[PDB]
Design a protein around this ligand. Sequence first.
Ligand SMILES: CCOC(=O)c1[nH]cc2c1NC1=C(C(=O)CCC1)[C@H]2c1cccc(Oc2nc3ccccc3[nH]2)c1
Length: 254
Amino acid sequence: QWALEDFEIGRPLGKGKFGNVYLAREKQSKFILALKVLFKAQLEKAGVEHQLRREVEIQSHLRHPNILRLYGYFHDATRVYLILEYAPLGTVYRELQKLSKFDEQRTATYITELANALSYCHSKRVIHRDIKPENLLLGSAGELKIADFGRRTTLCGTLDYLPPEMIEGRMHDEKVDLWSLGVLCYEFLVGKPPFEANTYQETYKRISRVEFTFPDFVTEGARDLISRLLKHNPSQRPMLREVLEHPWITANSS
Ligand SMILES: CCOC(=O)c1[nH]cc2c1NC1=C(C(=O)CCC1)[C@H]2c1cccc(Oc2nc3ccccc3[nH]2)c1
């Protein structure tokens, strides 16, 4: 059981849908973490309480170096407190906007970390994680952290990242995460997702048909990987272990 008096509150880190996030320190260990404050009055005016309990339960159960850690939680009369991992280096999205695109070494490393995290998630029956750059955080050593918990969107999800099977109303499984990995790998190397278009309808047709092109700088190895991940038929997409064994990955991942 934790209490607010167990932590030293620092500067605000951001704004949440239902409160604020603060940099904090556990008084005893002097460990730096993030403390997310959620207002009950706001959580109530949305009827998300049962949803919060579910998301919290998922996160708490997931223990991997490439997944944002939820250390614990507690609450008082008016607020709900989530004791979260602090990622000092911010979002991968922010880094991507700053650099515009990532080199092969950085990309292959990020993909490796994501593949490991996703492989662990799968082993725990956790699938279809929104791994878009904005949901990816960075540790002190620049290690990637999935932070999916809590840009064009259907009811199915993030448009630019939806696989053919989903958009086409068909059945899907964990292979949706391999498609996501291909879209992310492309976006890391290029700076934009592969099926971006003017209209919702155009994007849909682009995805459905798997219509995308590679800029001249994208190497043979990267094209091989992306092309294998972005297969229309889910069964033709490689397994996460095959991603980690891919020669482009073994050559460029640090
Ligand atoms: C770079 C410095 O920042 C951090 O290290 C850091 N660590 C955790 C968070 C964060 N920054 C921000 C968060 C926000 O939500 C708003 C914007 C800023 C929050 C956050 C962001 C993403 C995933 C999160 O993780 C979770 N958010 C939850 C909400 C409900 C239930 C369980 C949750 N787990 C939490």
